[PDB]
Structure formats: structure tokens, C-alpha cells
Ligand binder design. Structure first.
Ligand SMILES: C=C1C[C@@H]2CC[C@@]34C[C@H]5O[C@H]6[C@@H](O3)[C@H]3O[C@H](CC[C@@H]3O[C@H]6[C@H]5O4)CC(=O)C[C@@H]3[C@@H](OC)[C@@H](C[C@H](O)CN)O[C@H]3C[C@H]3O[C@@H](CC[C@@H]1O2)C[C@@H](C)C3=C
Ligand SMILES: Nc1nc2c(ncn2[C@@H]2O[C@H](COP(=O)(O)OP(=O)(O)OP(=O)(O)O)[C@@H](O)[C@H]2O)c(=O)[nH]1
Ligand SMILES: Nc1ncnc2c1ncn2[C@@H]1O[C@H](COP(=O)(O)OP(=O)(O)CP(=O)(O)O)[C@@H](O)[C@H]1O
Ligand SMILES: Nc1nc2c(ncn2[C@@H]2O[C@H](COP(=O)(O)OP(=O)(O)O)[C@@H](O)[C@H]2O)c(=O)[nH]1
Ligand SMILES: [Ca+2]
Ligand SMILES: [Ca+2]
Ligand SMILES: [Ca+2]
Ligand SMILES: [Mg+2]
Ligand SMILES: [Mg+2]
Lengths: 439, 428, 342, 54
């Protein structure tokens, strides 16, 4: 048993983290009190779930997590929430004033005054670990804290934990739910600074999640709560192998090994199915074939892009529920001769498959319906570079006029960092094109 | 939890200041005695942004009332909510400024400015995390214009890392015929361009035309104008005092609205446009709110938006309505008139929605635009300025207070530069 | 009020389409870099498909199919026909072709040895001129190495159908419109780009009776426009010729094969380029070029992704594009096409 | 079309299917960046106070 520590930064990180740990408790049968009746070994043990939960003598299971926000308003809800007894106050860290949607303010100005505090709080969790694997870091691209402080934290983590793995869960900005015109700036800046420090990052476009909620959950105007409960399902599907008994993706290092051939190109595309509304009176349960096929539909992806016009470097299929290998292999056979699936020449056309018999756990009173089988596909395709293209184009439009730049320079950041970050993104697009494009 | 300190200076500043406080006090369920009788718990969630507390649960407005004469501040005490204000926060002189910028900024005002900052300092010390200041004043007079900008400069010197926001009433020959107002306004704008992060251009020219042409008021009063000003100030501060995601604090607002430091002068807008004491029988739909708030006749700046381009826009819808329909309507406006929005600032229109509506309305919409068309306003002021200054007319009223002609030339040059900067981004 | 942008000023076809949309008074042209559009008349190269379909409140449509270049590149088309099981060697309407780099060199040489034991071929690339016809492989290989980019070696149809009087070669251009639903519409009006100089089996170097390009016929020919105006014969005349000379019809002897080939090519790549469930929609106009031998067998020569149109046919075709490819998605306030059902 | 590494347990199982074969900066440097940014802030504010003093 090797421990995993989750770090939630900024509003998006915290609120998404709330949803995840709520789902984890339900999945493992852990109460809001922290008590877990099915845990026969009191005050310790090295089970699979212990990778995410530590134990006390009173039989309390507390998440190996730290919450960090430069403003107190969001984490205050966690301090007074239904899961207040779950975390001990040390894990919840807040400042007085936030980064004001300004990367430079979160990274340089404010970030400098709380970084040592956060690291010391993280060091206390590490000391409780007999064999730490690394970290899972949740944050937005667009926020000043999610972007600026996170990149500072990742740099410090590589220094204090040079051997540990670090995975990202990143929220890609979407106008339909965005709160700042400079999010493209913040996204490029944090991606540039974090790139060499992250081993595998799962991007989630709010646009994709928003439309899925509208389209499949029939929600007219999706809220963060709507978005986050869906996001938590995807995150749960991905972390399930670390929290349960299995042989696929048992440790953080496996994610890089199975999904990331090239270090810089560490952004796997997540696709999830099925998403069914709980408001629908009854529902025809989808087969293994149907949910698998849906993994190659752009409308089910966490990032809208066209994998047909890119190449695959790796593909992992994560099933939860009533699934046997036989039906999966048959589903893949049908799909392979039906859809356009091209791998890079230096890679085998294959799928790594993991099955967890336990069906997806849903939040009681939520909008997602209970299904007997679900799947999350993790595919490293060059098609996700479309998201980099879009983001970089919006960057160029504003930066050409130097719009809003004075806000960053005012925080101590040099203008030269903009072009440096942008040129790094420019090389990143080229890398993707080299791998996935021909004549 | 992040406190704002409010300052009102001069006759206009105190009149619109008081009218602002009684309106928001109402919206937050606060009576003239300073006690909370509100039913909703939303009214109290962020009420610390504008109010302080005390034993017996007394909510005291974090406001400082300033003037070089006692007259207008006497009116504030007498009529409600005159007694909600902290008595020691009344700072006033006796001499007056005589509609003279120089007197407010250099002579008369200089003598009173220190006692004002002492009160500002005491308020700032009570704040867990001060975010900035908001000033209400006019630019045409002497105290609000001259002493107001002196205060802004001295406040910035002591709080250089805080946001400075102002509600600045621009002078109009239709409302006031005092001949030196263009001098006072031009001197003030010079100051604002340098020392504020956000300035709402509340134009008496536009306020008059709305009352005359739309509200059909043959002889509008200042009460009528302040009715429009009050509704606007409530609308533009909605995202600051209620639970929200967009522009929740002064700095985030400035970061979304101000792409270049000098271009921080906003055109406010509102719908529906109503008159005081006049009950509207039919509430507007989401489509109607959206069309009206973008209508040139609903702007408080007296500039034609069609004559320029929007750099950034903030929209606030209040009342119980469909978020879906609001999103649709705000989308079609941009898609219908995409040419008027600069293309080098993607998604430059942000929308917020608050469930709690203003008094007397089931729903309304407030518009905040950073448009290059605002150049027309400064261009109007500049012409009135040069007509007199090219002959040095009435200048002795200022040189008598120690000012030199060069200070006028510099102010004029800066405002003209501001106009040209707006023009260059209008042709980008 | 619908909105569109133009990113290809050189497109004569979509210049006319742009004119018609404005004439409706229900369309508005925006700056070419304004993202809030309904319709994009995109560029020919490196069209940013990745930025489409990400504008909330807008249904976006573009006049190109991402990936359709697989069909509109000479090297790409050859590889497509061979590898695609839907086509494969079960394709009897595509001349024997090989891709050669300055690779199927050995396979082409092996084919060249068998033909020698009618052995005339033609070398050409996607990048007027730039073409060489020869009976000797060494001449062709030297040219491919002489040139820079990749070329395609294809069997030259030695026995083409010849128009009389004149004894002259020719090719057929068919315009095909594929809409967002992947309906395949064949424009009823096609055109025959004819050669003016009589076909000569002996001399290949005098490329004017062998190449039927409109530019070459007006720059290397002295008989330009003598037989037909602008060396362009349309279906009504050609149909009458086939009836008088061969007692057959255009529909029966040729058009059936053309419709078959068109349907085959486009159905093959459908799963790769279809936008049915995409966040943005596509349509595109194609230019198919065919050859006909003396036995009235139709051959596919190539497919053009950015085709022009015949002068007389611009008004009708461009209007049809608006009716079927644009107004079908953005409705306003008998058909000239033949729907190739599938 | 080959299945490999089939692992089974009570919670579920995993395997791999092949359809076809193939054809950091130090703490020192970080401090130097953060303090260099802070100095640029201090300089910018110092100028503002100097300008306001004039
Ligand atoms: C009279 C008075 C006396 C009193 C003056 C109040 C005030 C407020 C302060 O700002 C300054 C102004 O008002 C200054 O006002 C000036 C004196 C010094 C005084 O000096 C200062 C201070 O005095 C006088 C005016 O400008 C009054 C205006 C003038 O239009 C130009 C006149 C037509 C003109 O006579 C013929 N061409 O209609 C009047 C139209 C305006 O009436 C006022 C009400 C009438 C006005 O309340 C309402 C507003 C909302 C309005 C629309
Ligand atoms: N999916 C999802 N996205 C969120 C959530 N909260 C914020 N976001 C997105 O995050 C971006 C804004 O960044 P925030 O995380 O809110 O800002 P921050 O990290 O708190 O940093 P500050 O600027 O200091 O407030 C926007 O694009 C939002 O759409 C959330 O709860 N769920
Ligand atoms: N394999 C072949 N056998 C006989 N003739 C051929 C041939 N390949 C090409 N041609 C002749 O070549 C001419 C066309 O050249 P080609 O179309 O390949 O180049 P191109 O793409 O620059 C012209 P377009 O795109 O307008 O059809 C035809 O008019 C035809 O007469
Ligand atoms: N909208 C509005 N404008 C006012 C009010 N009072 C004065 N003004 C305007 O302010 C200018 C006069 O300045 P004033 O504030 O009275 O002088 P001060 O006391 O020295 O600051 C004129 O242009 C008036 O039109 C008011 O209550 N409402
Ligand atoms: Ca245990
Ligand atoms: Ca590392
Ligand atoms: Ca005195
Ligand atoms: Mg925040
Ligand atoms: Mg061609």
C-alpha cells in the first residue's frame, strides 16, 4: 500500500474536491463522521482505500488531502459543510484576499506569502505516509489562484519530492461559465510553468461538461454543482484503480507508463459513458458495446475535438459494473472495423482494459441515474491539441494589443514571460503535429 | 468580508451619496435606526462589505461625509436615513469652495483634508481586509471636484495597493449654467485619469435627456436625476454586496473591465427607465431588458455606442427570471451586433444574475460598458474648455488661488490625449 | 440575419455564393477574423477546423470537409483506393497507379516489365505543365527525380474515345455537392474540356492532343474554339453526338458509371469525414474528372477539392449551393441536382 | 486479436488486448525569481510615492 495525497487549489479545485471526496465516502461506505463500519481493523491497516484515507485510534478515516485558497469564502463552506468532521483544520488553508483572476498575483505577489505554509502542511501529511506515491492536484486554468499558485506549488513539490509523481486535474476555461476575460493569459502562463513538473494531466473543458449536462441531463442552465458531480464521476473512474483491489494502474507511475510515451505530451483525453438523467421515467440500460462505442463520440469527451484527425499513442478502458472481458473484446472488434482508429507507427494498436464489478456510485438526490455498467476511456490522442490551438489563438488576439498586460507587469511579472510562455505553447503544438500529422 | 470605504464630497456627492445609502439599506433590510429587519439571509451574507457592526446588532454604514460647508450635510442628518451614519464621520468646514476647483484642491480644501483622512484611517483599521474606496462627487463644482481629487491623491499615497473607484457626475449646460464648470471638470478628469482604477461617468447631460425625452418631464428636478443615479449605483454595486461569481470585488472587476490603465471610464446603463413615485404597471421580459439596457437612450453617459466599439461589458440582471433565457438574449445581442465589439478581446461580455430585485421592480438590468464612444463626452467637455481658455476667460478666479496657466494647459493636453487613445483603439 | 466570413478571395465559385447571400438581405458579411459567424467560406490550406463549433449561441457551418484531401490528392487517392477494402483491387474504374518518391518503385518496375512482355504511362503530381508522358520508365523516373515533390505514375489510356470530326481527346468534369447530412448531389450539368489538335499515338512530346486542360488549349493550340466555343462542349451536344454517332445515350453509356464512381469514393471516406455528430457542420463542392475509352468505359482520373466552374454554369450551380448546402441549415423567410441515394 | 496479462480478483479483472503490433530548477533559482519580481513591485511603488510626493 502506497499513499496518495490530493491537493485542491482555488475555487474550482476546492469545489471539485468536495464532490470527489463526497463520492469517495459513499463508494467506500465511509460516514460524514469519518467512521467506516466495514473497516474491521481499527486505527490502522494497509488496505487499498488507505491510499486515500488515513486512520485514527477512534476509528476515523480522514482524507489524505489539503485544500488551499487565497480567499477564505469557499473553504469556509467546507469548514461548516456536512463533511466538516472529515478534515482536521490543518488540512484547510485560506488567505484573506484572492489573486483577482491574475496569474502574476497568485504566483508572485500573494503566492510568496503562503507557499511555505502550504508546503509545511503538506509535509505533515507526507510524514504520515509509509510509502508516498506522489500527488493529485486539482485546479482551474483561468483563476488567479488555480493558475498562479498551482504552478508555484508544483515547482516546490518537484524540489521537495524530486522522485514522487504528480498528476493534474485541470479545468480548461469556457466562456459559458467563465468569470474573466484574461483566462487565456492565465492558462498559457500556468501551462508553461507547470509543464516540466507534471507527469500526467487530465484536462476537463467546462464547455464539454456544460453541454453534456444540458444535452443528456436535460439541465437548462447547469450550475457548478451540476458540473462538479459529473466531473467527480470521471475523476472517480480514473482514481478507482488506486483505491480498490486490481492490477491496472495500481500506482501513479502506471499512468505515465501506460498513457504517456512522450513527457511533454502528457494530456490524455477522457471520454465517459453513459450519462443518464435521473428524471427520466425508466431507461433502457446500455450494453457493453453501446457504452464502448460512445467512447469514440466527440459529444461524450471531456474535451471537444476530433480524434479521427489525430493519432493514438495509448488507450485505456476503465469499466465499472456488469462487464466481462468477452463482451469487451467483441465490442472492440466491431468498433475497429467501423470507426477511424489510427495509432502512431511506433505503437501497438491495442487497449489496456480494467474492470471493476462495482457499478458507479451516484449521489443520492443528484441528477445522474444509477447504471449497471459504465466506462471511462483514457486515450492519449494528438486531437486534444485542438484545445491548445483555440487557447493560443485567443492569447494572440489580446497579447498583440497588450490588452490587460499591465495588470501582470504591475504584480512584478516581466512582459517577457508572456512571449516565453507562448513560444513554449507554440513548440507544444508543433510536437503534437509532428506525432499525428503526415502529408 | 472584504470591506469597502465610501466617501461623499461636496453638494452633489452627498446628495447622491445619501440617496445611495438609503436604497441599499432598504435592499439589505436595514431601517433608519440601523437595525436588521430583513427576512432573507442573503441580505446579510456580505453586508459587511459596506457596513460595520456593534453591540445590539447595529449595522453602521462605512461612509464618510465631506464638505467645505455645513448646508448639504445638515440635510443629510435631518431626513432619513440620516441617523444611520456615524456622527464622528461628518467632516465639514464653513468657508465653502465657491464652485472653484482651485479652492477645493489647493486652498480651502487643503485645510480640511487632514481631518478627513483621520476618519478614513480609523475606518480602514476596522477592516479585516480593505479592498478599496468608492467616491461620489461632481466634476463641475469646487469641493467634490477639487477637494475630491485631492482626497483621492492623498488616499492613494497612504493606500497605494488598494482599488480606487468613483461615481463622477459630469457637468452639463442643460442642468447647471455655472460658467467655470468646464474648467473644474477638465482639471478633475486629469486627476481621475491618473488616480482611479474605475470611474463611472454619470453624465448630467444624459440624465437630463432621459428625464425630458423618455420620462416626459418638462421640468426635471435633481430628485429626478438622482432617482436615475441611485438606481444605477445600486445596479453597478449588486455584484459587490450579494453572493456572486462575476466581478465580486473591486479588483476582479477592474481586471475584467480595464485592458489599459488610462481607459477606465465606464458608460453605465439601466432598464427599465422609470420616474420616482410613478408605479410601473407592466414588468419587462428578459428580451426587453436586454434590448433596452443596450439602447443608446438608456445610457447615463450621453454617448452614442454606435459611434464607437465596446472594449468590455458587464451586465447585471436582477429578479427571478430564466438564466437560460438571459444567456440566450445576451448571446444574440453580441451575435447580432458583433461589429461593435472589439475582436481582439474575445468573450468580452460578462453576465451576472441576482435573485433579489430592486425596490418597486420584479426585475431589471444594469449595463456597464467600456466603450470608445466615451470620447464624445470628454470631447464635449474639451470644446467648452478651449472656447474660454483660448481667451483666458475667467482664469483670474483660479490664478487668484495661486494656480498658473501651465497647469490648465497640461490638464487640457491630458484629456485630449485620452480622447485620441480611445480613437486609436476604435480603429484597431 | 445570418452571418458569414470569407477567407478565400481567389475562389470564383464562393465569390458568387457570397454575392447571392448578400442579395438576399438576410445575410451579413463580417470581418474575416470575426469568430461570431454562422458560415465560413474557408481558405484552401490549413483551414482551422479546430476553432469551429466553439461559439455558444451559434450554429456554425464551413464549406470544406476536414480530411477530404485524402480524396483530392493524387498520391492520397492512389493509396486510398488500394488500402480501402471498400475499393481495393475490386476497383475496375481507376487506372493502374503507383506512388513514387524522388514507395512503389519496385512494384512499378515489375508492372513495367510485364506490360513490355501496350506499355505507355504518365507521370504527374499534385503540385499547368509538370507532366510527362513516356513509354520508357527511365525517362519518367529521371523526371520524378528531376522534379522536387512526390509524383504519381499512372497507366496512360492509349485508346480514348475520340470526338469526330477532329479525332480529338477529351475529359469530363462533374460537379458534386455534399451537404451536412452527407447527401451526395450531382450537378446535372457537366462539361467536356476538349482537345483541339487530333490525337496522335506516335508523338507524345507534342502535348496538346493528349492534355485537355483549358489553359494548355488556349496557349499551345491554334485550333482553340474552332470545333466548340472555348473547347467546352456541354451535355446536350455530347448527348446528341453519342446518339448520332453511336446510337447510345450519355446517361446509359457514361453517366451510370460516373454516378457509381462518385458514390463509391464518397461513401468510402464517409465515416472518416462525416460531421453528423460534430460540434460544427461541413459541406463541400467537388470536381470529379473522368476519361472514356473507345469501349465506352468510364475511368476516374482525379478529384478536385477546390474546383472552379464553367462560365455559363456559375449562376445555376452557385445558387444551388445556397439552396441545398446553406439555406438547408439556415432557412430564409425542379432541382438542378441528382441525388445519389445511399 | 490477442489477450494478455489477464488478472482476476474479487473486485474485478484487467487485461491487455493487442489488435496489431507496431510498424528542474532548484530552490535557490526559484527564490531568485520570486524576490526579483518583488523588487520590481517595490520599485514601481517607490516611483508612485515619489511622483505623489512631488
Ligand atoms: C434654479 C435652481 C436653484 C437650485 C440650485 C441647486 C444647485 C445645486 C448645486 O449645483 C449648482 C447648480 O444647482 C446651479 O444651478 C444654477 C444656479 C447656481 C447653482 O449652483 C450649484 C448648486 O445649486 C441654475 C441652473 O442651472 C438651473 C437650471 C437652468 O438650466 C441651465 C435653468 C434654465 C436657464 O435658467 C435658462 N437658460 O433650468 C434649471 C434646470 C435645472 O433645475 C434644477 C432645479 C432649480 C435649481 O435648483 C433641477 C435640475 C435637475 C435642472 C434640470
Ligand atoms: N467545473 C468547475 N469549474 C469552476 C468551478 N469554479 C470555478 N470554475 C472555473 O474556474 C475558472 C475561474 O477560476 P477560479 O478557480 O474560480 O479562481 P481561483 O482559483 O479561486 O483564483 P482567484 O482568481 O484568486 O479567485 C472559470 O473558468 C470557472 O469556470 C467549479 O466549481 N467547477
Ligand atoms: N492516365 C491518363 N490517361 C490518359 N489521359 C490522361 C491520364 N491522366 C491525365 N490525362 C489527361 O490529363 C489531363 C489532366 O491532367 P490532370 O487533371 O491529371 O492534372 P491537373 O489536376 O493539373 C488538371 P484538373 O485538376 O483540372 O483535372 C486530362 O485532360 C487528360 O486528357
Ligand atoms: N445628478 C446630480 N447632480 C448634481 C447634484 N447637485 C449638484 N449637481 C451638479 O454638480 C455641479 C455643481 O457642483 P456641486 O457638487 O454642487 O459643487 P461642490 O459642492 O463644490 O462640490 C453641477 O454641474 C450640478 O449640476 C445632484 O444632487 N444630483
Ligand atoms: Ca483499517
Ligand atoms: Ca519532475
Ligand atoms: Ca481658513
Ligand atoms: Mg477564488
Ligand atoms: Mg488537380
Amino acid at each position: 500500500m502506497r499513499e496518495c495525497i490530493s491537493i485542491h487549489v482555488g475555487q474550482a479545485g476546492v469545489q471539485i474536491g468536495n464532490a470527489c471526496w463526497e463520492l469517495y465516502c459513499l463508494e467506500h461506505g465511509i460516514q460524514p463522521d469519518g467512521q467506516m463500519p466495514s473497516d474491521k481493523t481499527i486505527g490502522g491497516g494497509d488496505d487499498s482505500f488507505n491510499t486515500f484515507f488515513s486512520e485514527t485510534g477512534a476509528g476515523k478515516h480522514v482524507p489524505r488531502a489539503v485544500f488551499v485558497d487565497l480567499e477564505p469564502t469557499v473553504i469556509d463552506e467546507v469548514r461548516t459543510g456536512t463533511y466538516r468532521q472529515l478534515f482536521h483544520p490543518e488540512q484547510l488553508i485560506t488567505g484573506k484576499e484572492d489573486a483577482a483572476n491574475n496569474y502574476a498575483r497568485g504566483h508572485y505577489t500573494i503566492g510568496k506569502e503562503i507557499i511555505d505554509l502550504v508546503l509545511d502542511r503538506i509535509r505533515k501529511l507526507a510524514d504520515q505516509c509509509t510509502g508516498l506515491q506522489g500527488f493529485l492536484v486539482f485546479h482551474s486554468f483561468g483563476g488567479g489562484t488555480g493558475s498562479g499558485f498551482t504552478s508555484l506549488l508544483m515547482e516546490r513539490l518537484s524540489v521537495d519530492y524530486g522522485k514522487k509523481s504528480k498528476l493534474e486535474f485541470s479545468i480548461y476555461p469556457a466562456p459559458q461559465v467563465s468569470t474573466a476575460v484574461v483566462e487565456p493569459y492565465n492558462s498559457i502562463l500556468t501551462t508553461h510553468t507547470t509543464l516540466e513538473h507534471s507527469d500526467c494531466a487530465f484536462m476537463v473543458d467546462n464547455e464539454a461538461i456544460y453541454d453534456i449536462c444540458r444535452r443528456n441531463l436535460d439541465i437548462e442552465r447547469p450550475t457548478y454543482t451540476n458540473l462538479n458531480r459529473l466531473i467527480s464521476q470521471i475523476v472517480s473512474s480514473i482514481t478507482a484503480s488506486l483505491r480498490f483491489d486490481g492490477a491496472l494502474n495500481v500506482d501513479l507511475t502506471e499512468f505515465q507508463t501506460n498513457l504517456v510515451p512522450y513527457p511533454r505530451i502528457h494530456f490524455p483525453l477522457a471520454t465517459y459513458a453513459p450519462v443518464i438523467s435521473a428524471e427520466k421515467a425508466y431507461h433502457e440500460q446500455l450494453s457493453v458495446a453501446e457504452i464502448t462505442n460512445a467512447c469514440f463520440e466527440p459529444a461524450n469527451q471531456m474535451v471537444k475535438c476530433d480524434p479521427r484527425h489525430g493519432k493514438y499513442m495509448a488507450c485505456c478502458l476503465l469499466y465499472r459494473g456488469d462487464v466481462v472481458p468477452k463482451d469487451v473484446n467483441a465490442a472492440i472488434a466491431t468498433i475497429k472495423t467501423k470507426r477511424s482508429i489510427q495509432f502512431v507507427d511506433w505503437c501497438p494498436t491495442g487497449f489496456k482494459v480494467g474492470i471493476n464489478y462495482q457499478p458507479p456510485t451516484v449521489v443520492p438526490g443528484g441528477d445522474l441515474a444509477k447504471v449497471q455498467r459504465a466506462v471511462c476511456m483514457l486515450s492519449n490522442t494528438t486531437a486534444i491539441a485542438e484545445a491548445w490551438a483555440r487557447l493560443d489563438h485567443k492569447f494572440d488576439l489580446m497579447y498583440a494589443k497588450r490588452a490587460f498586460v499591465h495588470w501582470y507587469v504591475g504584480e512584478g511579472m516581466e512582459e517577457g514571460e508572456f512571449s516565453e510562455a507562448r513560444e513554449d505553447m507554440a513548440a507544444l503544438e508543433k510536437d503534437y503535429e509532428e506525432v499525428g500529422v503526415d502529408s | 468580508m472584504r470591506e469597502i470605504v465610501h466617501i461623499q464630497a461636496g453638494q452633489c456627492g452627498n446628495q447622491i451619496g445619501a440617496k445611495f445609502w438609503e436604497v441599499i439599506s432598504d435592499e439589505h433590510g436595514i431601517d433608519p435606526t440601523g437595525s436588521y429587519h430583513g427576512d432573507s439571509d442573503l441580505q446579510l451574507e456580505r453586508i459587511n462589505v459596506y457596513y460595520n457592526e456593534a453591540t445590539g446588532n447595529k449595522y453602521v454604514p462605512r461612509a464618510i461625509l465631506v464638505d467645505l460647508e455645513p448646508g448639504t450635510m445638515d440635510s443629510v442628518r435631518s431626513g432619513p436615513f440620516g441617523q444611520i451614519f456615524r456622527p464622528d464621520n461628518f467632516v465639514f468646514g464653513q468657508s465653502g469652495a465657491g464652485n472653484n476647483w482651485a479652492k477645493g484642491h489647493y486652498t480651502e480644501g487643503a485645510e480640511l483634508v487632514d481631518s478627513v483622512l483621520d476618519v478614513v484611517r480609523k475606518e480602514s483599521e476596522s477592516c479585516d481586509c480593505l479592498q478599496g474606496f468608492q467616491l461620489t462627487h461632481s466634476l463641475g463644482g469646487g469641493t467634490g471636484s477639487g477637494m475630491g481629487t485631492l482626497l483621492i491623491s492623498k488616499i492613494r499615497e497612504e493606500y497605494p495597493d488598494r482599488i480606487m473607484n468613483t461615481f463622477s457626475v459630469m457637468p452639463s449646460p442643460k442642468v447647471s449654467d455655472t460658467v467655470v464648470e468646464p474648467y473644474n471638470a477638465t482639471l478633475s478628469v486629469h486627476q481621475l485619469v491618473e488616480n482611479t482604477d474605475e470611474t463611472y461617468c454619470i453624465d448630467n447631460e444624459a440624465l437630463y435627456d432621459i428625464c425630458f425625452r423618455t420620462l416626459k418631464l418638462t421640468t426635471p428636478t435633481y430628485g429626478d436625476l438622482n432617482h436615475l443615479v441611485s438606481a444605477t449605483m445600486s445596479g453597478v454595486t449588486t455584484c459587490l454586496r450579494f453572493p456572486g461569481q462575476l466581478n465580486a470585488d473591486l479588483r476582479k472587476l477592474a481586471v475584467n473591465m480595464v485592458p489599459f490603465p488610462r481607459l477606465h471610464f465606464f458608460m453605465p446603463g439601466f432598464a427599465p427607465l422609470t420616474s420616482r413615485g410613478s408605479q410601473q404597471y407592466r414588468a419587462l421580459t428578459v428580451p426587453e431588458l436586454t434590448q433596452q439596457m443596450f439602447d443608446s437612450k438608456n445610457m447615463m453617459a450621453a454617448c452614442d455606442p454606435r459611434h464607437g466599439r465596446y472594449l468590455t461589458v458587464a451586465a447585471i440582471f436582477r429578479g427571478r427570471m430564466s438564466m437560460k433565457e438571459v444567456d440566450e438574449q445576451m448571446l444574440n445581442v453580441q451575435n447580432k451586433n458583433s461589429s461593435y465589439f472589439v475582436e481582439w478581446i474575445p468573450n468580452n461580455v460578462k453576465t451576472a444574475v441576482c435573485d433579489i430585485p430592486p425596490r418597486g421592480l420584479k426585475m431589471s438590468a444594469t449595463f456597464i460598458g467600456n466603450s470608445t464612444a466615451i470620447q464624445e463626452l470628454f470631447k464635449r467637455i474639451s470644446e467648452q474648455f478651449t472656447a474660454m481658455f483660448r481667451r483666458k476667460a475667467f482664469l483670474h478666479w483660479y490664478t487668484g488661488e495661486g494656480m498658473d496657466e501651465m497647469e490648465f494647459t497640461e490638464a487640457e493636453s491630458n484629456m485630449n490625449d485620452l480622447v485620441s487613445e480611445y480613437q486609436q483603439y476604435q480603429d484597431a | 440575419m445570418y452571418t458569414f466570413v470569407v477567407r478565400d478571395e481567389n475562389s470564383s465559385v464562393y465569390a458568387e455564393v457570397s454575392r447571392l447571400l448578400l442579395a438576399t438581405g438576410q445575410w451579413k458579411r463580417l470581418r474575416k477574423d470575426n469568430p461570431r459567424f454562422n458560415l465560413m467560406l474557408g481558405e484552401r490550406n490549413r483551414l482551422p477546423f479546430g476553432r469551429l463549433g466553439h461559439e455558444p449561441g451559434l450554429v456554425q457551418l464551413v464549406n470544406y470537409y476536414r480530411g477530404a484531401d485524402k480524396l483530392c490528392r493524387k498520391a492520397s487517392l492512389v493509396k486510398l483506393i488500394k488500402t480501402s477494402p471498400e475499393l481495393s483491387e475490386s476497383c475496375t474504374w481507376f487506372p493502374e497507379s503507383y506512388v513514387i518518391y524522388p514507395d512503389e518503385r519496385e512494384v512499378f518496375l515489375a508492372a513495367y516489365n510485364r506490360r513490355r512482355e501496350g506499355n505507355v504511362w504518365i507521370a504527374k503530381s499534385s503540385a499547368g505543365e509538370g507532366i510527362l508522358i513516356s513509354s520508357e520508365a527511365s525517362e519518367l523516373l529521371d523526371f520524378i527525380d528531376e522534379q522536387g515533390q512526390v509524383h504519381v505514375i499512372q497507366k496512360y489510356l492509349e485508346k480514348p474515345l475520340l470526338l469526330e470530326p477532329g479525332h480529338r481527346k477529351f475529359d469530363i468534369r462533374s460537379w458534386v455537392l455534399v451537404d451536412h447530412l452527407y447527401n451526395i448531389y450531382l450537378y446535372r450539368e457537366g462539361v467536356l474540356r476538349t482537345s483541339s489538335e487530333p490525337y496522335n499515338s506516335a508523338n507524345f512530346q507534342d502535348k496538346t492532343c493528349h492534355l485537355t486542360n483549358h489553359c494548355i488549349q488556349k496557349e499551345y493550340s491554334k485550333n482553340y474554339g474552332r470545333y466548340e466555343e472555348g473547347n467546352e462542349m456541354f451535355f446536350e451536344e455530347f448527348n446528341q453526338y453519342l446518339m448520332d454517332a453511336l446510337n447510345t445515350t450519355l446517361e446509359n453509356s457514361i453517366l451510370l458509371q460516373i454516378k457509381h464512381i462518385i458514390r463509391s469514393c464518397l461513401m468510402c471516406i464517409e465515416p472518416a469525414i462525416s460531421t453528423k455528430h460534430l460540434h460544427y457542420q461541413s459541406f463541400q463542392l467537388f470536381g470529379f474528372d473522368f476519361m472514356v475509352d473507345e469501349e465506352l468505359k468510364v475511368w476516374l482520373i482525379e478529384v478536385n477539392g477546390a474546383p472552379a466552374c464553367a462560365q455559363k454554369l456559375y449562376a445555376e450551380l452557385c445558387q444551388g449551393i445556397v439552396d441545398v448546402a446553406i439555406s438547408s441549415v439556415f432557412p430564409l423567410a425542379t432541382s438542378i441536382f441528382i441525388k445519389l441515394h445511399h | 486479436m490477442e489477450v494478455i496479462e489477464l488478472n482476476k480478483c474479487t473486485s474485478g479483472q484487467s487485461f491487455e488486448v493487442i489488435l496489431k503490433p507496431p510498424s528542474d530548477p532548484s530552490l535557490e533559482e526559484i527564490q531568485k525569481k520570486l524576490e526579483a519580481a518583488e523588487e520590481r513591485r517595490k520599485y514601481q511603488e517607490a516611483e508612485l510615492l515619489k511622483h505623489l510626493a512631488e
